[PDB]
C-alpha cells in the first residue's frame, strides 16, 4: 500500500517530503485533481489505504476544504477501506492561542460538512504538523499506525512489557526514517520524543564513523555481528536505552535509574520481546 500526500499549492507537501522522506510516499500536485483524467485515479486509489490532505492554517482553506470533500467522496466511491487524515500545516509561526482556535474552527467546519455530505461512517483524523518541529514525524507515525494491521498486538506487548519491567515509556522506531511503529498506552511527551529521535542520530552517526571494518562487506560477513545496543544515563534520574530489534527496527525505552539497577531483568524482557517481534514479523503459513 502507498501513502498519498494531497493538498493545494503552497501547502507544504514538498517540504514534508524533504524533511521526512529525504531526511511508498507519493506527492500529488496541488492542481490537476481527480476531476482531471491525466492519471488513472481509480486504479491508484484502490491500492492506497492512507489519504493525507495538507491544509495551510494561515491561508484560506474553504476551497481546500471543498477539494478535500470532493476527494473524500471520490475515494469513498472508489474503495470503503481508505483512511483519511488532515494535516494542518505551517504552525511554527503561530502562537499557542492561535493553534487551538484554528484546530477547533477546522474540525467544526469539517465534521459538520461530513454529516452534510452523508458519509458519517468513515473516520477522518486531524493532525497539527510543522516541518521545523517533530510533530510531522508524530503525525506520520499515527498515519502509519493505521496501515499496519498488527498494531494492537504490538501495543499490548509494549503495554505488558512496560508494566512488567517498570519501563516508563517505550517506542518501536524505524531507524532510517525516525518514525515509531508502535508505542505504549501512556502519552508521548515532546521532550521525550526529541531526545528519543536524537538518540538514533547519535547511534547511527557513531556507528557510521566506527563501523567500517566488516559491517558493509559485499559478499557476506564471516562472523555474525552483535545487535546495536546502547545505554545513556542522564542527570535527571532517567536512563534511555536502545536495542536493535530487526534489520530496520529498534526499541528505545525510558526507565528511571532506580529501576535500572535491575537492568538484567529488563534485558531479559527485551530479549523476550525481541523473540516475539521476530516471530510476528517472520513469514509464516
Amino acid at each position: 500500500r502507498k501513502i498519498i500526500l494531497m493538498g493545494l499549492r503552497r501547502s507544504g507537501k514538498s517540504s514534508i517530503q524533504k524533511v521526512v522522506f529525504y531526511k511508498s510516499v507519493w506527492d500529488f500536485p496541488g492542481q490537476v485533481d481527480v476531476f482531471d483524467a491525466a492519471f488513472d485515479f481509480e486504479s491508484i486509489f484502490t491500492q492506497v489505504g492512507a489519504l493525507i490532505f495538507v491544509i495551510d492554517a494561515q491561508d484560506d482553506y474553504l476551497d481546500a476544504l471543498a477539494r478535500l470533500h470532493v476527494t473524500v467522496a471520490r475515494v469513498v466511491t472508489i474503495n470503503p477501506n481508505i483512511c483519511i487524515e488532515v494535516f494542518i500545516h505551517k504552525v511554527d509561526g503561530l502562537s499557542d492561542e492561535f493553534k487551538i482556535d484554528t484546530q477547533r474552527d477546522i474540525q467544526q467546519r469539517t465534521q459538520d460538512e461530513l454529516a452534510d455530505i452523508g458519509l458519517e461512517n468513515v473516520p477522518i483524523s486531524f493532525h497539527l504538523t510543522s516541518i521545523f518541529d517533530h510533530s510531522i514525524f508524530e503525525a506520520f507515525s499515527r498515519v502509519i499506525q493505521k496501515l499496519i494491521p498488527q498494531l494492537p498486538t504490538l501495543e499490548n506487548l509494549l503495554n505488558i512489557f512496560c508494566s512488567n519491567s517498570l519501563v516508563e515509556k517505550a517506542y518501536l522506531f524505524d531507524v532510517l526514517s525516525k518514525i515509531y511503529v508502535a508505542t505504549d498506552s501512556s502519552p508521548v511527551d515532546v521532550q521525550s520524543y526529541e531526545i528519543c529521535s536524537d538518540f538514533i542520530d547519535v547511534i547511527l552517526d557513531i556507528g557510521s564513523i566506527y563501523g567500517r571494518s566488516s559491517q558493509l562487506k559485499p559478499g557476506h560477513s564471516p562472523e555474525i555481528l552483535d545487535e546495536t545496543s546502547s545505554v545513556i544515563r542522564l542527570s535527571n534520574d532517567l536512563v534511555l536505552f536502545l536495542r536493535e530489534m530487526n534489520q530496520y527496527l529498534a526499541l528505545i525505552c525510558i526507565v528511571r535509574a532506580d529501576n535500572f539497577e535491575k537492568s538484567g531483568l529488563i534485558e531479559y524482557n527485551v530479549q523476550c520481546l525481541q523473540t516475539a517481534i521476530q516471530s510476528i514479523f517472520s513469514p509464516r503459513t
Binding site: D60, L62, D63, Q108, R109, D112, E113, D116
Partner: protein
C-alpha cells in the same frame, strides 16, 4: 386526479416523501419538489401554472391536504408541507412560499418601457428549540421572524428575538445555519437592522451617519431639457427614475432588501433599501438631490468572511468605483445610458 397520485406514490422513482421526523405526519412532502416532479413526469403539461392548477384540483378533491389539517388554504408553491390523505404547526416549522417572478422578456428596460407594469403573509414567526445537542439542562427557546416569500433577486431575512437563550448555543445554531447556507450556494451574514436611521431613533446609532453619493443626471440630459424622462408621462417619471436608479444598483450587485417595518404605517417615510451580494454595503434611495445613501455593514466581521464576501478592503474599492460611476468618470455612465438607448430600437 387519482392516477397522478398513484404515479406520485411509486416507491422506486416517485417523489421523495418525508421520513418519520418528529412532529411530521407520514406521507408528507414539500410542494416545490412535487411541482418539479409534475413538470417532468406527467401526462403532458409543461409550465408551472397548470401544475399549480392540477395540485389545486387535487387539494379541492381532498386527495392531498396540508400537514396541519388546515383544509381552507389554496395550493402554495414553495417549501410548504402537504400530506396524502392548526396554528401551532405554524410556530414549529419554517414555511417559505416561492415567488414566480416573471423574467425580463422585454429587451427594453423597465425605465424605458412605453407602459409601466405597475394570501401568504409578508412575515412569519416560528418558535425555535435552540438547544438541540442538549448542552444545557434548562429549556431554551427563541422567536424567529422570517420572510414568508422567497425571490431569487431579493434578500431573505431572518430575525431572532430571545430572552431565555444562552447565546453560545444560539451562536452554534447560527454557525450551523451559516455552514449550511455556504454549502447550499447562498450567503448568510449578520446585517444592521437600522442602517439608515437617525441617532434619535430606536434602531439608530449616535455616531453613525450615512454617506451621500450624488448621481450626475445632468450629463445624461439632452440639449434643452430638465427632466430625464420628459418624452414619457411626468406622473410616473420619478418612478421611472427609481427604476433607472435601481438599474445602476443592479449593475454593481445590490439586491433589494424588503425589510419589515416594525409597526410603521405611512409608507412615504420609509425608503427602499439595497444590500450587496457580499453583505458589506447597505444602499438606500432617498425621496431633490438625486443620489444614493451609503452605509457600511459593521456587523460583518472576520468570522463570517469567506470568498463570497471579499476581503476587508472590498467596500472601499466598491465605494471608489461607485463614486466614479455616479460622477460620470471617463464617460462611463453615458456608456451605460446610451446603451439603454440602444435598447430603444
Amino acid at each position: 386526479l387519482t392516477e397522478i397520485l398513484e404515479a406520485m406514490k411509486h416507491p422506486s422513482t416517485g417523489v421523495q416523501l418525508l421520513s418519520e421526523q418528529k412532529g411530521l405526519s407520514p406521507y408528507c412532502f414539500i410542494s416545490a419538489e412535487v411541482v418539479h416532479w409534475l413538470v417532468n413526469h406527467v401526462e403532458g403539461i409543461q409550465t408551472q401554472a397548470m401544475a399549480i392548477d392540477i395540485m389545486q384540483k387535487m387539494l379541492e378533491e381532498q386527495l392531498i391536504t396540508h400537514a396541519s389539517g388546515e383544509a381552507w388554504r389554496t395550493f402554495i408553491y414553495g417549501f410548504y408541507f402537504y400530506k396524502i390523505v392548526f396554528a401551532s404547526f405554524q410556530r414549529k416549522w419554517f414555511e417559505v412560499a416561492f415567488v414566480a417572478e416573471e423574467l425580463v422578456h422585454s429587451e427594453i428596460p423597465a425605465f424605458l418601457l412605453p407602459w409601466l407594469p405597475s394570501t401568504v403573509p409578508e412575515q412569519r414567526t416560528v418558535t425555535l428549540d435552540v438547544d438541540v445537542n442538549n448542552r444545557t439542562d434548562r429549556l431554551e427557546w427563541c422567536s424567529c421572524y422570517y420572510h414568508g416569500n422567497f425571490s431569487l433577486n431579493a434578500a431573505f431575512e431572518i430575525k431572532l428575538h430571545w430572552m431565555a437563550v444562552t447565546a453560545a448555543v444560539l451562536f452554534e445554531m447560527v454557525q450551523g445555519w451559516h455552514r449550511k447556507a455556504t454549502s447550499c450556494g447562498f450567503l448568510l451574514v449578520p446585517v444592521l437592522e437600522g442602517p439608515f436611521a437617525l441617532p434619535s431613533y430606536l434602531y439608530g446609532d449616535p455616531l453613525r451617519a450615512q454617506l451621500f453619493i450624488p448621481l450626475n443626471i445632468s450629463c445624461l440630459l439632452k440639449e434643452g431639457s430638465e427632466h430625464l424622462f420628459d418624452s414619457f408621462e411626468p406622473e410616473t417619471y420619478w418612478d421611472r427614475m427609481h427604476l433607472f436608479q435601481e438599474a445602476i444598483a443592479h449593475r454593481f450587485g445590490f439586491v433589494q432588501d424588503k425589510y419589515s417595518a416594525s409597526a410603521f404605517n405611512f409608507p412615504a417615510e420609509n425608503k427602499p433599501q439595497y444590500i450587496h451580494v457580499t453583505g458589506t454595503v447597505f444602499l438606500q434611495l432617498p425621496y431633490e438631490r438625486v443620489g444614493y445613501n451609503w452605509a457600511y455593514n459593521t456587523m460583518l466581521t472576520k468570522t463570517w468572511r469567506s470568498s463570497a464576501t471579499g476581503d476587508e478592503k472590498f467596500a472601499d474599492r466598491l465605494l471608489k468605483d461607485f463614486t466614479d460611476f455616479c460622477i460620470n468618470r471617463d464617460n462611463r455612465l453615458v456608456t451605460f445610458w446610451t446603451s439603454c438607448l440602444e435598447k430603444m430600437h
